[PDB]
Symmetry: D2
């Protein structure tokens, strides 16, 4: 059906994209980057994240596929050498779709609301000075966090920033989000839980400013300064990203290949 | 209905048990420690774990209640001062039952099989020398683990040994188990994932010996030497423990009270 | 002799300073904030750090004393209630001086050199995008670090940011510096040592840019954006801070009081 | 002069030892395993540790050399291919000796005293049940430790068990020892420092039993059950191990080669 291809934009990725478009020309496949049904990303995980955010309003109508042209990217299922095989299999169709959970971030202001969707994670840091927030879980005051910041990760994000922060890797069939600390202060007077926390669907984690109300909020690649923040709210999204799957590539093998050996 | 009470066996817990039995005598409540319907544990979390293992063949017919007579125990919902209030509320009934997931460990031998059920965790260490096992996830060889041992935790166990090992705390509505490492060796030749791993229901984690086949396996309080082990298999149990709940005491508040302040 | 007093500037600290000046007026003590011989800091550790940096060119002529007017500050030896006792003991003199090591940071540029002295630590982060540096130890290429940043700590700084990053606490009689990682990336292609590293006097740790040459460098409280950086070099300073000591307050007791109980 | 060679005892190591003995026969070199002046260890780090403990009463008269016949061992300076070159260089002499610090463990009993010397580390675990000790630093009660155990590491041991426990790697010119925790319990009632602690020469760390007095104490490879323990005392030894050095192989390069790439 309708499909489009994003490229990382180096020569290897552009030419692979051109060759796949030529190969798709030999089938009932219309290039359409307004309303695609398949979105192919050629590059790295950064490329795949940008493709996801380019179509985040049509997530339920799109299956994604990643081709990694560098060292294996985690959202990539294919090497460039298999692209012809991919064209042919997509062209037929009848592949299997798998869905991963996503993270909703809501940012509320003084005098207003912005929501963002994350495939990897949403993080919060201060805009300059100390970072201090009260952490409220389903309206229960849980802790006052002092430190560098906090990271809230989807399951497929757990292998990314979350992992570097000591968080657990969780299989993406678990509808959850995971909160990790960045350099928390713990002494006689200041206390945090320390451990990563794993939240199910429908739990709401709210960060509330204590002093400064300005924060740097990142969602996947994109980092914005928000001013006069009243609340940051995290919950598992009702929306999901869908991947087209043509063969078995289990998550735990994907983890093995990315971190142990390949 | 039918009920029994276990005690930690110090004077404070024994007398509380005697007083609750006297108070239950004023209602349609029959003391029965063969086929109870309510099991009250008076003591600490060790006491509550022993009560769970004393009735692990009737889990589906029993609701558990814990009273902590020391500093707050994590499976405890009541202080000794509220025991009269508890007697009265239980006696009426119409409480709410909540269920937590449990962990199944299967140990296979040479020339045989033993299964165990865990409320907190199951751990494996060597019987003396180096601990080396291959870690196999749904029949995929994932890593060769060298170190002190491994811990597989239920959700309610994540606040226990798991937490001390760096694992994530997970809300018990998530049907999962979590594997943490004990002092893994990582150098040029030996490699583990490092991170805790969180597994959904129906995933099977198998540990397979490499050299030595003798291991010390702990399940909650109980540690046994197993000889000539061919495999240790972990999966989320189909069985669940049921608690009688009389009031709201959310898991995250329970975590707050146990680790942040109370 | 000559002395001065800095204040955190709240009402409690200002009035304590005024009262100590009045008490010093009854002795051979001249207030002199150009060339003091004793520098008293009234406030918190931030106050004490600012006092240190105000006199960092006369470190060898100055003994420092800290009074904490909030919850115990780590460079503080006195509570406000003991200030009269302090005035009297200082006025006599014949106290003991103890010295802690300091950290030298050298920043070299394109087309130039800046050096800074740290009592707690010097950290480096990127100016926006990814942080990637080559870590060179005594001219040996040791690792390529990818992550949020790096922290180099003095011994007395090991209880501050360093501690939050997982670093070891080291007794300040050890002339050393300690490098800790902030959220390093470790996968199949990217590898860091992970562990904190402890360097003796005369070892030189050099960070060399890989791509971006702009970095945010913090030295104790003070954070500056440096552009067109060619190298950042760390070594234990030859300079030391001197404290006036009037009674035994061992470092490990100070650690106990600050983190375990007091 | 006088020399001996230990072997790991596989065919490759035995034949290398025989060939080196034959090569030493062509020089003024007498094989003497009672009073050697050079001790060559052919094998792995376990082999080198056993050689050290075989001669621990003549440390001041001996220079050690390690040849690794497997993947690089950390106390090894030579590959088997360079053994002829080693024979020749040793035979002349005029090499440089370098010294690393060692750790003294003293175990005191009821009704008695045993001391041990460690090149890597000394650890303490319980003999079965919970491990609880009071940690006393220079006669100051510092913390009550509850957990799996404690590890006290020399500088050259910091890359071994210590590293797996989160400890810092410290250059062996620093005369220190480092204490790391194994799975400490930290909750509302139980508190440890968490961080590794680095102690200078002449500081004494004493572990004192709280309840159980039976402990499993390991010193390098060797693990013994001690009963009726009154105290375990750690301090940097006055004794040092001496290595014969024929070429530059800096510690930080040795770390790089063992953990980053080689
Ligand atoms: N232009 C890169 C922008 N990043 C794109 C991405 C990604 C990504 N996602 C995953 C994933 N789910 N599971 C495993 N592998 C992953 N990859 C891999 O991470 C690397 C890329 N990233 C960096 O070098 C750091 C950087 O560009 O500051 C490549 O190796 C990918 O292959 C954005 C993402 O970078 C993550 N990130 C930021 N700071 C991090 C830190 N200190 N530690 C670890 N990850 C960090 C964060 O998750 C964000 O979403
Ligand atoms: N006679 C005690 C035998 N233990 C009973 C228990 C328990 C328990 N369960 C939980 C829980 N789910 N969430 C939080 N609090 C918990 N508690 C608390 O842990 C403490 C008890 N335990 C010890 O002191 C250590 C010991 O007796 O070796 C009390 O403070 C309870 O309150 C058995 C359980 O002890 C755990 N354990 C063993 N080694 C551990 C370590 N190094 N770090 C942390 N926990 C460890 C393991 O989970 C096992 O199931
Ligand atoms: N206006 C404060 C600016 N900071 C002054 C200081 C200090 C300080 N030094 C020590 C010390 N050597 N050993 C133990 N206690 C220490 N204190 C204590 O740390 C707290 C103050 N600091 C913050 O809240 C964080 C902040 O103002 O971003 C008080 O509790 C002091 O008492 C500057 C210092 O703040 C440190 N810092 C920065 N980010 C940190 C993090 N994520 N985790 C831990 N420390 C962090 C860094 O060491 C810097 O030098
Ligand atoms: N038959 C082996 C008995 N071990 C000999 C040794 C050693 C050794 N010393 C160092 C060192 N200073 N810096 C770096 N590399 C080192 N190696 C390397 O460690 C590996 C050997 N050891 C094991 O597999 C674990 C085991 O035999 O339980 C080889 O890769 C050597 O090359 C005794 C030593 O094993 C250490 N050890 C024990 N439990 C550990 C754990 N969970 N994590 C890390 N190290 C552990 C402890 O230091 C002890 O002294």
């Amino acid at each position: 059906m309708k499909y489009m291809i994003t490229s990382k934009g180096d020569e290897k990725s552009d030419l692979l994209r051109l060759n796949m478009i030529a190969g798709f020309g030999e089938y009932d496949m219309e290039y359409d980057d307004v309303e695609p049904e398949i979105v192919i990303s050629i590059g790295g995980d950064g490329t795949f994240l940008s493709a996801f955010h380019q179509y985040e309003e049509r997530l339920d109508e799109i299956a994604f596929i990643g081709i990694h042209t560098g060292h294996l990217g985690f959202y990539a299922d294919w090497r460039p050498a298999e692209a012809d095989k991919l064209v042919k299999l997509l062209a037929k169709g009848e592949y299997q779709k798998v869905s991963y959970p996503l993270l909703k971030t809501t940012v509320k202001y003084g005098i207003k609301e912005a929501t963002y969707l994350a495939l990897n994670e949403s993080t919060v840091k201060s805009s300059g000075g100390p970072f201090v927030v009260d952490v409220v879980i389903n309206d229960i005051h849980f802790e006052r966090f002092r430190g560098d910041g906090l990271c809230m990760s989807t399951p497929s994000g757990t292998t990314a920033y979350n992992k570097s922060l000591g968080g657990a890797l969780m299989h993406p069939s678990i509808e959850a989000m995971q909160l990790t600390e960045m350099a928390s202060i713990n002494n006689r007077v200041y206390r945090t839980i320390g451990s990563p926390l794993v939240f199910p669907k429908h739990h709401v984690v709210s960060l509330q400013p204590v002093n400064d109300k300005d924060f740097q909020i990142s969602v996947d690649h994109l980092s914005i300064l928000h001013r006069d923040v009243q609340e940051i709210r995290y919950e598992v999204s009702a929306k999901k990203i869908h991947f087209a799957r043509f063969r078995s590539f289990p998550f735990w093998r994907r983890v093995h290949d990315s971190f142990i050996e390949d």
